[PDB]
Design an enzyme around this catalytic site. Sequence first.
Site, PDB file in Angstrom:
ATOM      1  N   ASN A   1      88.811  11.276  55.211  1.00  0.00           N
ATOM      2  CA  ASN A   1      89.662  10.995  54.046  1.00  0.00           C
ATOM      3  C   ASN A   1      91.139  11.012  54.500  1.00  0.00           C
ATOM      4  OD1 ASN A   1      89.503  13.758  54.502  1.00  0.00           O
ATOM      5  ND2 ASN A   1      89.401  14.334  52.288  1.00  0.00           N
TER       6      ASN A   1
ATOM      7  N   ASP B   1      94.330  17.721  53.424  1.00  0.00           N
ATOM      8  CA  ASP B   1      93.446  18.862  53.182  1.00  0.00           C
ATOM      9  C   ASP B   1      93.155  19.543  54.515  1.00  0.00           C
ATOM     10  OD1 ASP B   1      91.581  17.181  54.493  1.00  0.00           O
ATOM     11  OD2 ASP B   1      90.117  17.287  52.862  1.00  0.00           O
TER      12      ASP B   1
ATOM     13  N   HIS C   1      97.554  15.933  61.330  1.00  0.00           N
ATOM     14  CA  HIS C   1      96.604  14.881  61.681  1.00  0.00           C
ATOM     15  C   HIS C   1      95.471  14.786  60.665  1.00  0.00           C
ATOM     16  CE1 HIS C   1      97.937  14.939  66.188  1.00  0.00           C
ATOM     17  NE2 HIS C   1      98.762  14.245  65.410  1.00  0.00           N
ATOM     18  N   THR C   2      95.443  15.667  59.664  1.00  0.00           N
ATOM     19  CA  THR C   2      94.524  15.505  58.544  1.00  0.00           C
ATOM     20  C   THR C   2      94.827  14.228  57.775  1.00  0.00           C
ATOM     21  OG1 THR C   2      93.371  16.823  56.901  1.00  0.00           O
ATOM     22  CG2 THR C   2      95.748  16.674  56.650  1.00  0.00           C
TER      23      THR C   2
ATOM     24  N   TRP D   1      91.377  11.100  62.218  1.00  0.00           N
ATOM     25  CA  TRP D   1      90.816  12.400  62.510  1.00  0.00           C
ATOM     26  C   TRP D   1      89.823  12.829  61.424  1.00  0.00           C
ATOM     27  CZ3 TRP D   1      95.638  10.787  63.797  1.00  0.00           C
ATOM     28  CH2 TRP D   1      96.070  11.064  65.100  1.00  0.00           C
ATOM     29  N   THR D   2      90.023  12.244  60.232  1.00  0.00           N
ATOM     30  CA  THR D   2      89.216  12.676  59.095  1.00  0.00           C
ATOM     31  C   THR D   2      88.573  11.527  58.317  1.00  0.00           C
ATOM     32  OG1 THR D   2      91.054  12.739  57.520  1.00  0.00           O
ATOM     33  CG2 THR D   2      90.602  14.768  58.786  1.00  0.00           C
TER      34      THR D   2
ATOM     35  N   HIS E   1     108.543  12.978  64.497  1.00  0.00           N
ATOM     36  CA  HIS E   1     109.196  12.509  65.727  1.00  0.00           C
ATOM     37  C   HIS E   1     110.719  12.558  65.657  1.00  0.00           C
ATOM     38  CE1 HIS E   1     105.758  10.468  68.095  1.00  0.00           C
ATOM     39  NE2 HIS E   1     105.415  11.647  67.600  1.00  0.00           N
TER      40      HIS E   1
ATOM     41  N   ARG F   1     104.745  11.033  60.408  1.00  0.00           N
ATOM     42  CA  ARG F   1     104.997  10.843  61.834  1.00  0.00           C
ATOM     43  C   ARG F   1     106.457  10.541  62.121  1.00  0.00           C
ATOM     44  NH1 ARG F   1     103.284   8.176  66.918  1.00  0.00           N
ATOM     45  NH2 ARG F   1     102.637  10.170  67.851  1.00  0.00           N
TER      46      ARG F   1
ATOM     47  N   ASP G   1      94.312  18.137  70.527  1.00  0.00           N
ATOM     48  CA  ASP G   1      93.647  18.778  69.385  1.00  0.00           C
ATOM     49  C   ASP G   1      92.600  19.771  69.907  1.00  0.00           C
ATOM     50  OD1 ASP G   1      94.874  17.073  67.269  1.00  0.00           O
ATOM     51  OD2 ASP G   1      93.515  15.512  68.050  1.00  0.00           O
TER      52      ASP G   1
ATOM     53  N   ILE H   1      94.199  11.817  52.338  1.00  0.00           N
ATOM     54  CA  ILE H   1      94.110  13.053  51.571  1.00  0.00           C
ATOM     55  C   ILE H   1      94.541  14.244  52.399  1.00  0.00           C
ATOM     56  CG2 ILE H   1      92.458  14.587  50.392  1.00  0.00           C
ATOM     57  CD1 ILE H   1      93.080  11.857  48.927  1.00  0.00           C
TER      58      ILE H   1
HETATM   59  C1  HEM Z   1     100.484  18.861  68.583  1.00  0.00           C
HETATM   60  C2  HEM Z   1     100.906  17.792  69.348  1.00  0.00           C
HETATM   61  C3  HEM Z   1     100.869  16.318  68.938  1.00  0.00           C
HETATM   62  C4  HEM Z   1     100.453  15.263  69.652  1.00  0.00           C
HETATM   63  C5  HEM Z   1     100.125  15.238  71.178  1.00  0.00           C
HETATM   64  C6  HEM Z   1     100.349  14.117  68.716  1.00  0.00           C
HETATM   65  C7  HEM Z   1      99.855  12.964  69.166  1.00  0.00           C
HETATM   66  C8  HEM Z   1      99.744  11.851  68.209  1.00  0.00           C
HETATM   67  C9  HEM Z   1      99.262  10.522  68.581  1.00  0.00           C
HETATM   68  C10 HEM Z   1      98.982  10.087  70.057  1.00  0.00           C
HETATM   69  C11 HEM Z   1      99.089   9.749  67.490  1.00  0.00           C
HETATM   70  C12 HEM Z   1      98.606   8.354  67.272  1.00  0.00           C
HETATM   71  C13 HEM Z   1      99.892   7.519  67.320  1.00  0.00           C
HETATM   72  C14 HEM Z   1      99.249   6.078  67.019  1.00  0.00           C
HETATM   73  O1  HEM Z   1      98.493   5.435  67.924  1.00  0.00           O
HETATM   74  O2  HEM Z   1      99.449   5.351  65.920  1.00  0.00           O
HETATM   75  C15 HEM Z   1      99.578  10.614  66.375  1.00  0.00           C
HETATM   76  C16 HEM Z   1      99.680  10.087  65.009  1.00  0.00           C
HETATM   77  C17 HEM Z   1      99.957  11.074  64.064  1.00  0.00           C
HETATM   78  N1  HEM Z   1     100.535  12.282  64.104  1.00  0.00           N
HETATM   79 FE1  HEM Z   1     100.553  13.449  65.776  1.00  0.00          FE
HETATM   80  N2  HEM Z   1     100.724  14.575  67.497  1.00  0.00           N
HETATM   81  C18 HEM Z   1     101.073  15.884  67.473  1.00  0.00           C
HETATM   82  C19 HEM Z   1     101.604  16.589  66.485  1.00  0.00           C
HETATM   83  C20 HEM Z   1     101.952  16.059  65.259  1.00  0.00           C
HETATM   84  C21 HEM Z   1     102.611  16.781  64.218  1.00  0.00           C
HETATM   85  C22 HEM Z   1     103.306  18.116  64.597  1.00  0.00           C
HETATM   86  C23 HEM Z   1     102.561  16.092  63.076  1.00  0.00           C
HETATM   87  C24 HEM Z   1     103.156  16.220  61.547  1.00  0.00           C
HETATM   88  C25 HEM Z   1     103.110  17.479  61.268  1.00  0.00           C
HETATM   89  C26 HEM Z   1     101.826  14.827  63.447  1.00  0.00           C
HETATM   90  C27 HEM Z   1     101.508  13.963  62.502  1.00  0.00           C
HETATM   91  C28 HEM Z   1     100.844  12.752  62.857  1.00  0.00           C
HETATM   92  C29 HEM Z   1     100.311  11.668  61.934  1.00  0.00           C
HETATM   93  C30 HEM Z   1     100.503  11.863  60.418  1.00  0.00           C
HETATM   94  C31 HEM Z   1      99.733  10.714  62.647  1.00  0.00           C
HETATM   95  C32 HEM Z   1      99.130   9.461  62.091  1.00  0.00           C
HETATM   96  C33 HEM Z   1     100.115   8.286  61.944  1.00  0.00           C
HETATM   97  C34 HEM Z   1      99.506   7.033  61.275  1.00  0.00           C
HETATM   98  O3  HEM Z   1      98.546   7.041  60.569  1.00  0.00           O
HETATM   99  O4  HEM Z   1     100.123   5.958  61.526  1.00  0.00           O
HETATM  100  N3  HEM Z   1     101.475  14.883  64.766  1.00  0.00           N
HETATM  101  N4  HEM Z   1      99.956  11.846  66.855  1.00  0.00           N
HETATM  102  K   LIG Z   2      92.056  14.500  55.318  1.00  0.00           K
END
Ligand code: HEM
Ligand SMILES: [K+]
EC number: 1.11.1.11
Length: 249
Positions: free
Chosen positions: A181, A186, A162-163, A178-179, A41, A37, A207, A184
């Site tokens: 696991n 995947d 988000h996997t 979202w998952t 960002h 993330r 999503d 992981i």
């Molecule tokens: C497609 C549009 C996207 C939207 C609207 C979006 C929205 C969000 C939101 C609202 C969260 C939760 C933030 C939280 O409350 O902790 C999140 C977390 C996350 N996003 Fe996305 N996201 C997008 C695309 C991406 C992309 C492009 C990636 C990396 C390729 C990404 C990777 C992640 C990850 C890994 C988390 C989890 C973070 C954690 O576990 O702390 N997102 N995203």
């Molecule tokens: K997963």
Amino acid sequence: GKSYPTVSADYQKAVEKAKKKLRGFIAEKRCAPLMLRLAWHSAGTFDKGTKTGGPFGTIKHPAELAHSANNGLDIAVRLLEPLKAEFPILSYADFYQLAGVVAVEVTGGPEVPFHPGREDKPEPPPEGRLPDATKGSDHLRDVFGKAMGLTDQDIVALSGGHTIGAAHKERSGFEGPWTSNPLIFDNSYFTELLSGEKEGLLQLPSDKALLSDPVFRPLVDKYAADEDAFFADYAEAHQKLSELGFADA
Ligand code: HEM
Ligand SMILES: [K+]
């Protein structure tokens, strides 16, 4: 259209060393999703028409961390500061993108090619460029396509990030993984999206937009049916993302 800059041998040695330390640190701290993330960002603010924003180290600035889209990423910045300090020759810009590449690798994902040379820039971009989780396909194309310059395929594959990980009600306000696991890497993000809502698992409106868009839905289907295909397209897209505005745009 990438022409990567030359960096010294000592810079390259530090990249390789940092990459190994990041693996161990990120695996120990169980923070791969947050680090992905942080890298995303960092990069996702790039606007191709003005050539502003992008993965140039500005997310460590308090002004950019303060963007509401970035709630919680100050944790990420702080977690990395001691390790970053062991690699003073690296730009923050490169260090955060390397952390994102490693986050994907150590959770079992594809090996995303990494090229060093990003400079740390002085001005953070204005707030408001990162996507809004409550909007849909037109909005996603505005942000990934019209601003960043990525393709429709890139949008679906990168959504699969988000996997790993979860939302937090105190950060975005959404809550849960979202998952089943979430450490992981995947294709489970897409298989859950197809199957309906399962209790305890999260689907953002952004999503769900992928399931009803005529271009995005066949990609969701491919990825749910073929993880290898997902990994190939993911790696292409993450590399492009991590290089926006860098080594040409
Ligand atoms: C497609 C549009 C996207 C939207 C609207 C979006 C929205 C969000 C939101 C609202 C969260 C939760 C933030 C939280 O409350 O902790 C999140 C977390 C996350 N996003 Fe996305 N996201 C997008 C695309 C991406 C992309 C492009 C990636 C990396 C390729 C990404 C990777 C992640 C990850 C890994 C988390 C989890 C973070 C954690 O576990 O702390 N997102 N995203
Ligand atoms: K997963």
